[PDB]
Design an enzyme around this catalytic site. Structure first.
Site, PDB file in Angstrom:
ATOM      1  N   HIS A 155       0.831  -1.199   0.000  1.00  0.00           N
ATOM      2  CA  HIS A 155       0.000   0.000   0.000  1.00  0.00           C
ATOM      3  C   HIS A 155       0.870   1.255   0.000  1.00  0.00           C
ATOM      4  O   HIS A 155       1.899   1.305   0.675  1.00  0.00           O
ATOM      5  CB  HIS A 155      -0.922   0.002   1.221  1.00  0.00           C
ATOM      6  CG  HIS A 155      -0.183  -0.067   2.520  1.00  0.00           C
ATOM      7  ND1 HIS A 155       0.015   1.028   3.333  1.00  0.00           N
ATOM      8  CD2 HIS A 155       0.416  -1.109   3.143  1.00  0.00           C
ATOM      9  CE1 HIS A 155       0.707   0.663   4.398  1.00  0.00           C
ATOM     10  NE2 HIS A 155       0.963  -0.630   4.308  1.00  0.00           N
ATOM     11  N   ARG A 159      -6.298  -0.970   4.461  1.00  0.00           N
ATOM     12  CA  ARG A 159      -5.326  -0.378   3.551  1.00  0.00           C
ATOM     13  C   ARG A 159      -4.982  -1.344   2.421  1.00  0.00           C
ATOM     14  O   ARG A 159      -5.060  -0.995   1.240  1.00  0.00           O
ATOM     15  CB  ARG A 159      -4.058   0.012   4.311  1.00  0.00           C
ATOM     16  CG  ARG A 159      -3.917   1.508   4.532  1.00  0.00           C
ATOM     17  CD  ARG A 159      -2.624   1.844   5.259  1.00  0.00           C
ATOM     18  NE  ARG A 159      -2.492   1.106   6.512  1.00  0.00           N
ATOM     19  CZ  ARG A 159      -1.469   1.251   7.347  1.00  0.00           C
ATOM     20  NH1 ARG A 159      -0.494   2.104   7.062  1.00  0.00           N
ATOM     21  NH2 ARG A 159      -1.420   0.546   8.469  1.00  0.00           N
ATOM     22  N   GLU A 214       0.731  -5.925   9.691  1.00  0.00           N
ATOM     23  CA  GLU A 214       1.991  -5.257  10.003  1.00  0.00           C
ATOM     24  C   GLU A 214       2.416  -5.516  11.445  1.00  0.00           C
ATOM     25  O   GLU A 214       1.579  -5.601  12.344  1.00  0.00           O
ATOM     26  CB  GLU A 214       1.863  -3.748   9.774  1.00  0.00           C
ATOM     27  CG  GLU A 214       3.086  -2.957  10.210  1.00  0.00           C
ATOM     28  CD  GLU A 214       4.376  -3.488   9.614  1.00  0.00           C
ATOM     29  OE1 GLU A 214       4.481  -3.543   8.368  1.00  0.00           O
ATOM     30  OE2 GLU A 214       5.281  -3.850  10.393  1.00  0.00           O
ATOM     31  N   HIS A 246       2.552  -5.664   4.238  1.00  0.00           N
ATOM     32  CA  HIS A 246       3.343  -4.520   4.693  1.00  0.00           C
ATOM     33  C   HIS A 246       4.829  -4.825   4.628  1.00  0.00           C
ATOM     34  O   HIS A 246       5.240  -5.990   4.547  1.00  0.00           O
ATOM     35  CB  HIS A 246       2.980  -4.135   6.129  1.00  0.00           C
ATOM     36  CG  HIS A 246       1.532  -4.298   6.446  1.00  0.00           C
ATOM     37  ND1 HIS A 246       0.630  -3.260   6.416  1.00  0.00           N
ATOM     38  CD2 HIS A 246       0.829  -5.401   6.778  1.00  0.00           C
ATOM     39  CE1 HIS A 246      -0.572  -3.715   6.714  1.00  0.00           C
ATOM     40  NE2 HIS A 246      -0.482  -5.014   6.937  1.00  0.00           N
TER      41      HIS A 246
END
Length: 211
Positions: free
Chosen positions: A15, A66, A93, A163
């Site tokens: 992202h 996200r 994450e 992430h």
């Protein structure tokens, strides 16, 4: 994309920049709202993924809006929503403990690159309550191995949206890094990144993009 019993191809899309990102503050597990750069990045990424001609067979994302969103955008952009875009909570994450909400400036100003580094990167150490790489990996790999080790062997190509840490851990275990060799790597935000894995799920050349 990849061939049967051949170098498996894994596309990773991180992202772009989230709202909190612009503010320059620690994120963590919280689910922020992507920004124009992120969206534009996602769209561009998708357009970048579809422009070159890279087709997707299966897709993987995290349990965060996200990425859960960024995936829909890229997937909706590339023009292949039909693709199997899965979501994983383990692909999230690395937790930031009580650091979530601390301006990098203050954080770095109170923990310096040193503490901040050992706090953010290190390898196994994690901030007060926050998670680390090994942890994330250890808890991310299962999804990978479990629901990503059977297809990667057949010779299919897959998407991945989580992430830096997630992918870090991924690339880590995917490359067989070393406690002091994974904290130096790096990825690209907004622009995806494909891995040239083998029929077992290990890199066999080098990462790459489309843009």
């Amino acid at each position: 994309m990849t061939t049967e019993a051949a170098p498996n191809l894994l596309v990773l899309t991180r992202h772009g920049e989230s709202e909190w990102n612009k503010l320059n503050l620690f994120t963590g597990w919280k689910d922020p709202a992507l920004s124009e750069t992120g969206i534009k990045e996602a769209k561009l990424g998708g357009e970048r993924l579809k422009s070159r001609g890279y087709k997707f067979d299966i897709a993987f994302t995290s349990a965060l809006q996200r990425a859960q969103k960024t995936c829909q955008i890229i997937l909706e952009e590339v023009g292949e929503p039909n693709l199997e875009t899965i979501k994983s909570e383990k692909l999230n994450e690395r937790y930031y403990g009580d650091l979530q909400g601390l301006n990098k400036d203050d954080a770095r100003k109170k923990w310096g690159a040193e503490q901040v580094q050992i706090w953010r990167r290190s390898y196994d150490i994690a901030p007060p309550n926050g998670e680390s790489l090994k942890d994330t990996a250890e808890r991310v790999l299962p999804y990978y191995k479990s629901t990503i080790v059977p297809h990667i062997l057949k010779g299919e190509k897959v998407l991945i949206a989580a992430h830096g840490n997630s992918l870090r851990a991924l690339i880590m275990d995917l490359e067989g890094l070393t406690g002091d060799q994974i904290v130096k790597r790096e990825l690209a935000t907004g622009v995806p990144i494909v891995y040239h894995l083998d029929k077992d799920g290990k890199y066999v050349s080098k990462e790459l993009i489309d843009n």
